[PDB]
Write a protein that binds this DNA or RNA. Structure first.
Ligand SMILES: [Mg+2]
Ligand SMILES: [Mg+2]
Ligand SMILES: [Zn+2]
Lengths: 135, 72, 99, 97, 220
RNA sequence: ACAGGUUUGG
């Protein structure tokens, strides 16, 4: 018939050995496909033990240097007037234009944080965006 | 036909119901194996002994392992 | 070829940062007798209540404005190995595509 | 070789921590007007954390100052001084529904 | 019989036998909210190697490995449909139950989006009929059911030796799925993209099988 | 020790 065992291993590891033993005298059609293109991980059963102690997950947080600049704009003026449009792939927000102006002014050899921060807000008035400083 | 089975354990299990009181039930362990490395085991529990043996034999084929045997 | 690392940095979700009080636009995709399932576009759809002003102007496919509060309501309780996800989002109605 | 990879930095959007009403303040045992804003006007029970909302430091010092002022003779125990009844309500408890 | 084995052995010698690489791209997967997952608190422990990072609580999936696993899954799906394999889309989710059934109808494969019965795949000779033919491939569009627990078919496939290709979110358990794909199954665009990918993978496979049979008829 | 019998509605 077959092997209804789960914790021993994978379906391939349970069918190939059975066919080698000679009980299953008919080869499944998917076995040739599995031998031709095996997956990256063998589907072995693994029990999700809970993580105790000082151990922590191996995932690393996502943070960029642009976030350190966006924090300044979000603490100074808050949310921009032009609402975000999550459907447009190339949508550029007010804070995105601000951090672009910031990183552009950084190349001019400006090391003062105030010089890099207020000049971008003053230059955005040339493009003509409206800023609402939260006080 | 090449499979051979053996009974490993036989036990008269009792259960206390509401009306019949003691309910004698036979539970047995049955192992199957052909001799080429493929084998398995199962548990058959029923009321009659001949029925428990048959259920164990029919359920032992579904659970089969393969034992890696050095030089067989 | 543009890999994932480059296309993720230019995502609007990355530019938005935290989801606390952000002005977004969402298109309604389903209509109930009084509730509105608005998909702001990030992960989930927020459920809002139909206001008394221009309540008839809200139809299937209309784009509206929202102030996003939370992206996905998840929290932990006693004896829960994981969190209890609401499978929704938290947002309030302000306008309907003021333009 | 990619330059758009996330960098292991701190959280820039980390909001400041919430402060208690007396955070970075100087509590005393003689300001009966200050200590009365945390006791019940009808009985004199000292309100707890769930009603006041004070962080771990000032909560105990307020209780110590109240217990000192109730024995030294600064503030009555069985009730609240009615002269300090017109003080602004700081607690989060509503009696008259 | 000597000529029929060549039809089966022909696609096994080539890697992209059906040209499935043009069906999608990393950008096509990014534009469908696939790279987005649940919060960090709902993270299953077996998703740390399948996650790219965490953007303020919300985890992000690595689209490179996503696309690689998707290529492998689509290849394995196309080969089964070419070899006349019964493909069952099992997905218990009361948001796209209509879309999944319509995709299965347009593909000619079977679907299951209602209450999954207990002895369906195990006690099949009593639930379906005297002697039935079990699905040769099981495709999961939502691994977790309405109780946020792993589905029953994802275990029954491994218990009956049936291959499984499943979309696993950040809270799913890919320990038993044969060809898992780390993605998002909560977004309408994501589920539409996966449905269309499987649609074209089944359509091209069936059409190429018909063309190979037509060529075999002229072979002699 | 290659072990087996013996508690209990089980
Ligand atoms: Mg999900
Ligand atoms: Mg005893
Ligand atoms: Zn304090």
């Amino acid at each position: 018939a077959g092997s209804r065992l789960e914790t021993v291993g994978s379906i391939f590891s349970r069918t190939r050995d059975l066919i080698r033993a000679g009980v299953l005298k008919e080869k499944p059609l998917w076995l040739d496909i599995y031998n031709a293109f095996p997956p990256l991980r063998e589907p072995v059963f693994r029990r999700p033990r809970l993580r105790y102690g000082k151990a922590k997950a191996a995932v690393q947080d996502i943070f960029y240097h642009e976030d350190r600049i966006r924090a300044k704009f979000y603490s100074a003026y808050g949310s921009g007037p032009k609402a975000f449009d999550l459907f447009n792939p190339n949508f550029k927000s007010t804070c995105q234009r601000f951090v672009e102006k910031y990183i552009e002014l950084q190349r001019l050899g400006e090391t003062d944080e105030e010089k890099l921060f207020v000049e971008a807000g003053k230059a955005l008035l040339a493009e003509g965006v409206t800023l609402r400083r939260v006080g | 036909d090449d499979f051979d089975t053996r009974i490993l354990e036989v036990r008269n299990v009792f259960n206390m119901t509401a009306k019949e009181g003691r309910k004698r039930s036979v539970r047995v362990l049955v192992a199957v194996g052909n001799g080429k490395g493929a084998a398995g085991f199962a548990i058959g529990k029923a009321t009659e002994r001949a029925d428990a043996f048959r259920k164990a034999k029919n359920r032992a084929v579904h659970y089969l392992h393969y034992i890696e045997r050095y030089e067989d | 070829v543009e890999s994932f690392a480059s296309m993720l940095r230019h995502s609007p979700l990355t530019q938005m940062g935290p989801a606390k009080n952000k002005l977004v636009i969402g298109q309604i995709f389903h209509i109930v007798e009084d509730d509105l399932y608005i998909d702001f576009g990030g992960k989930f759809h927020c459920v809002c209540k139909r206001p008394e002003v221009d309540g008839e102007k809200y139809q299937k496919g209309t784009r509206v404005r929202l102030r996003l509060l939370d992206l996905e309501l998840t929290s932990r309780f006693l004896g829960a190995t994981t969190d209890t996800t609401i499978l929704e989002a938290d947002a309030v109605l302000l306008g309907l595509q003021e333009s | 070789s990619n330059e758009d990879l996330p960098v292991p930095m701190e959280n820039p959007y980390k909001e400041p921590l919430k402060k208690c009403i007396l955070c970075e303040k100087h509590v005393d045992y003689k300001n009966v007007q200050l200590l009365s804003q945390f006791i019940s006007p009808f009985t004199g029970c000292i309100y707890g954390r769930h009603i006041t909302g004070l962080c771990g430091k000032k909560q105990k010092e307020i209780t110590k100052a109240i217990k000192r002022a109730q024995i030294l003779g600064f503030m009555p125990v069985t009730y609240k001084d009615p002269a300090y009844l017109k003080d602004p309500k700081v607690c989060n408890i509503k009696y008259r529904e | 019989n000597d000529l029929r084995d060549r039809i089966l052995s022909e696609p096994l010698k080539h890697a992209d036998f059906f040209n499935l690489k043009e069906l999608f791209s990393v950008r096509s997967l990014f534009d469908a909210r696939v790279h987005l997952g649940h919060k960090a608190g709902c993270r299953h422990r077996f998703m740390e190697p399948y996650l790219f990072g965490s953007r303020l609580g919300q985890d992000i999936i690595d689209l490179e490995q996503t696309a690689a696993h998707l290529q492998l899954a689509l290849n394995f799906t196309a080969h089964v449909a070419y070899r006349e394999g019964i493909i069952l889309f099992v997905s218990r989710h009361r948001q796209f139950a209509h879309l999944i059934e319509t995709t299965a109808r347009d593909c000619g494969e079977y679907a299951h989006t209602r209450y999954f019965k207990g002895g369906l795949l195990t006690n099949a000779p009593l639930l379906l009929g005297p002697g039935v033919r079990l699905p040769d491939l099981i495709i999961f569009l939502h691994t977790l059911n309405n109780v946020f627990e792993p589905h029953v078919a994802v275990r029954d496939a491994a218990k009956m030796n049936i291959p499984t290709v499943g979309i696993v979110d950040t809270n799913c358990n890919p320990a038993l799925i044969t060809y898992p794909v780390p993605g998002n199954d909560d977004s309408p665009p994501a589920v539409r993209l996966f449905c269309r990918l499987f649609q074209v993978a089944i359509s091209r496979a069936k059409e190429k099988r018909r063309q190979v049979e037509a060529l075999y008829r002229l072979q002699g």
